[PDB]
Design a protein around this ligand. Structure first.
Ligand SMILES: COC(=O)c1ccc(S(N)(=O)=O)cc1
Ligand SMILES: COC(=O)c1ccc(S(N)(=O)=O)cc1
Lengths: 304, 304
């Protein structure tokens, strides 16, 4: 019992973290096999950052200009290329700690673990969600760029995020490991406003199921609702519309708890309309939306 | 920028996690050098658990009755002893992944990372606090016992917690790595009520500093207070009394932010008396008390 914002164990990812220095800029790189992946803004000089021409900047750069340090051993760089907003640095040595991995571009509302790193050294791990507006609410200081988001399925690390920038509003933007930004964000120092940060309805509902399972039931009501009635309320409260796919994904929590998805929807509706009235749910005074149905099932069943 | 409930990277601890089976009971063990540490309740049969005589139960047990599995390789057990509520199993092989470590018994209000494990396999990592009542609010299913709490200082893992039991109220109790319970808890299936769960005042104040640093300032007021005036308010709201030691420990946050500790105290007092009025602080609708001053400094400076 008990429910926690849990991250994946970070060990498999810790052994992939390196430091990349180009000129005077140091950030984090991810070493998988004989490739080190990092943000292409490593080639930027603080003054290039207004509108960098990365193609023009990269012409000036040779294999030997990319200093790759894995702990206190230097990697020989034998090739470099730009794929979208990441650099791939071919090194002469395959990372001996390369776990089984995949690159996956995640959907908004999906959750992952961030290993926040500085100079290729891990500082901490936390659980995040890709916000509906393709930002994440992270914890990233100067030098944290190249820190990666991942999921683990038994022994396979799915890399989904590389950290690139902080928006003027102090939310975070980044790419998948093919270097495509989540959202409309570009790797340049300019006005980038995020869109409306909507609540991930299916994740709130999953977290309400997690609460019921863990004994927090005060919010279960005598009401039900329909997908259309519910979504009228979602719309008003900047909640993502709920689909039958969402309902289906909640099926195992529904089944375990014997609370119909639409009944739980009706409990959420009352919570949105009436607030918490100074009560808490799983020690939170607001509706948590950074647990997926899969996260609830995983944590409420002991998957390793 | 951004502030997250961050855990230590868990890799150093992942390589210490083993499975311990005695009879039909399996739980987690911690392998450091040639010793595996686990809860002594591994020797209990579901029926011993009402009032086990661990000395009498342990007489029936031989080195070969303790099955220690590290991944899918078995460790030879060459000695066993009970220290308080843990078993130490001497094995014939030193863990080759033994990090630098210490056993430390933490103070209430102190924070640590839990690597939650099942059958010696890590499932997740989260950040906890030793509550003032010597419980932790964890996430532990059947088979999670022997999961450990730790801090990391550069390269040295300080082990502070081994998980032992869930109280009837679904909070968690456990020992240090010398097998002494935090609090008055015993490893037996009986009525164990925790005391009053007070709020860790110094940690709330640290988190208010973290908020100001990160741009969340709405709660900064025109008031100050005294240690004695403040503690009158703390007492009423089941907040731990604040001492000059607490004030001293907040000194660097005071200095960085230029907000006197007692002024921040006066902001907290108003928050306790007036509530949040539906506002949030670092995305929380209640006062967070599971960041220490050291955690705020660490996260707000990039320590690895
Ligand atoms: C490569 O440069 C960038 O990608 C970048 C973007 C945004 C900002 S910020 N915090 O001024 O908005 C700073 C740097
Ligand atoms: C070794 O046995 C125990 O330490 C123990 C303590 C408490 C409980 S519980 N959840 O019934 O209160 C169950 C088992």
């Amino acid at each position: 019992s008990g429910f926690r914002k849990m991250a994946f164990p970070s060990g498999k990812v810790e052994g992939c973290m390196v430091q990349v220095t180009c000129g005077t800029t140091t950030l984090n790189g991810l070493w998988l096999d004989d490739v080190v992946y990092c943000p292409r803004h490593v080639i930027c000089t603080s003054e290039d950052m207004l509108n960098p021409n990365y193609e023009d900047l990269l012409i000036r750069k040779s294999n030997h200009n990319f200093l790759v340090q894995a702990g206190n051993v230097q990697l020989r760089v034998i090739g470099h290329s730009m794929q979208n907003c990441v650099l791939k640095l071919k090194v002469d040595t395959a990372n001996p700690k390369t776990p089984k991995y995949k690159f996956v571009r995640i959907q908004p509302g999906q959750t992952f673990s961030v290993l926040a790193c500085y100079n290729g050294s891990p500082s901490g791990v936390y659980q995040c969600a890709m916000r509906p507006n393709f930002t994440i609410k992270g914890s990233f200081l100067n030098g944290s760029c190249g820190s990666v988001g991942f999921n683990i399925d038994y022994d396979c690390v799915s890399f989904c995020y590389m950290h690139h920038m902080e928006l003027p509003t102090g939310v975070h933007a980044g790419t998948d490991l093919e270097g495509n930004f989540y959202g409309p964000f570009v790797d340049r120092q300019t006005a980038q406003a995020a869109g409306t940060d909507t609540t991930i309805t299916v994740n709130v509902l999953a977290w309400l199921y997690a609460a019921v399972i863990n004994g927090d039931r005060w919010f279960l009501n005598r009401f039900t609702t329909t997908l259309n009635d519910f979504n009228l309320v979602a719309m008003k409260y900047n909640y993502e519309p709920l689909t039958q796919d969402h309902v289906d994904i909640l099926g195992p929590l529904s089944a375990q708890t014997g609370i119909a998805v639409l009944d739980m929807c009706a409990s959420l509706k009352e919570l949105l309309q009436n607030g918490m009235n100074g009560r808490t749910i799983l020690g939170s005074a607001l509706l948590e939306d950074e647990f997926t149905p899969f996260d609830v099932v995983r944590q409420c069943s002991g998957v390793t």
